[PDB]
Amino acid sequence: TTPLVHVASVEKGRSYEDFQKVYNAIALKLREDDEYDNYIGYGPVLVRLAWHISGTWDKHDNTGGSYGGTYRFKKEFNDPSNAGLQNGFKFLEPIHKEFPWISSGDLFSLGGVTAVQEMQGPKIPWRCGRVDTPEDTTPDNGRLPDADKDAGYVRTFFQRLNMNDREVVALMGAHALGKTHLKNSGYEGPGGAANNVFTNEFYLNLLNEDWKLEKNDANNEQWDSKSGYMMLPTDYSLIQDPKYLSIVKEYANDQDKFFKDFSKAFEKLLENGITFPKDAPSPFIFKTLEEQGL
């Protein structure tokens, strides 16, 4: 019966103004709850959540993806690779009750877009229309990438998401955000000093820091710098691969180009698997709180 089809259906009677208010609510809670994770804030974990709900997508049969909003169900919830994302879900649940008309998928992806922008990242155009689907459509565990791999694994994995070399290197710049937590992933440490502000630091630290391969307290191995930063084995593989390396150099030298490419790739990621109608509205570019004087 071929890959199934997911048709974006705009929440009945809603437009830009409605979603901007959801944006604002998320954005205001981001500013208010500044203590979380030793004052890193909820920004990075909301970006990770958007990626994890989207990263389940399989282009071959159109299963997974952000459309169905299936992370709200137990099976995807207790996915061991989603360890720690419960915090992001609990962050968004009171806002869901505030705007119960919004689909789970639209909410999860919007949280990602809001976090990136509010952390002074690039503008990310966002489209509505994701629709909640039954529990039996929930993707099985094991669809997300393993961090203890090399460049070839990363390149092949992301083909399943229809991403090419430039898209993957751009997306991975988001690993300047937040940190790995030993209790969640078996990895520990931040990747730089600027943990909750969106910059091209990932690429700069990748090239300019002195990295050493070490065992952490979970006996997993990671690249550590004397300044106290870490890189996952998959992240470091970006400078082991010649094609990835040239793109890494590119973003290190030009944050503007990085911002533009990340915006495109992140939107594509959040929209993978979704069929947008001809009469579908143009994507929204939300204003930040700063722009609104809020």
Partner: protein
């Protein structure tokens, strides 16, 4: 003053988690991502010895006191457009009050 003396202990926890990764405070402490902050109060912006500033931090030329420091920390790139200090900002007044109080003592 418009600025109020808050909790230095709370300001210390604020500094440890949001500043220390880029700044040291004690006398003669090393420059890291950002300049050492000893004797920052009563000193013009861009005067730390050995650090490489942006020409936006220098041309601002502001005499740091507890008042304009509160404005700077609320929103760095709004007070000084072009600074390479990537920091979200202390948006809560009490947090600013607490941190400055700690910073006053620590940077003496």
């Amino acid at each position: 003053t418009e600025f109020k003396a808050g909790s230095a202990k709370k300001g210390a926890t604020l500094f440890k988690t949001r500043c220390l990764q880029c700044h040291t405070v004690e006398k003669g402490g090393p420059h890291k991502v950002g300049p050492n902050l000893h004797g920052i109060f009563g000193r013009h912006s861009g005067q730390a010895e050995g650090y490489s500033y942006t020409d936006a931090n220098i041309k601002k030329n502001v005499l740091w006191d507890e008042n304009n420091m509160s404005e700077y920390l609320t929103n760095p790139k709004k007070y000084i457009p072009g600074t390479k200090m990537a920091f979200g900002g202390l948006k809560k007044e009490k947090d600013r009050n607490d941190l400055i109080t700690y910073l006053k003592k620590a940077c003496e």
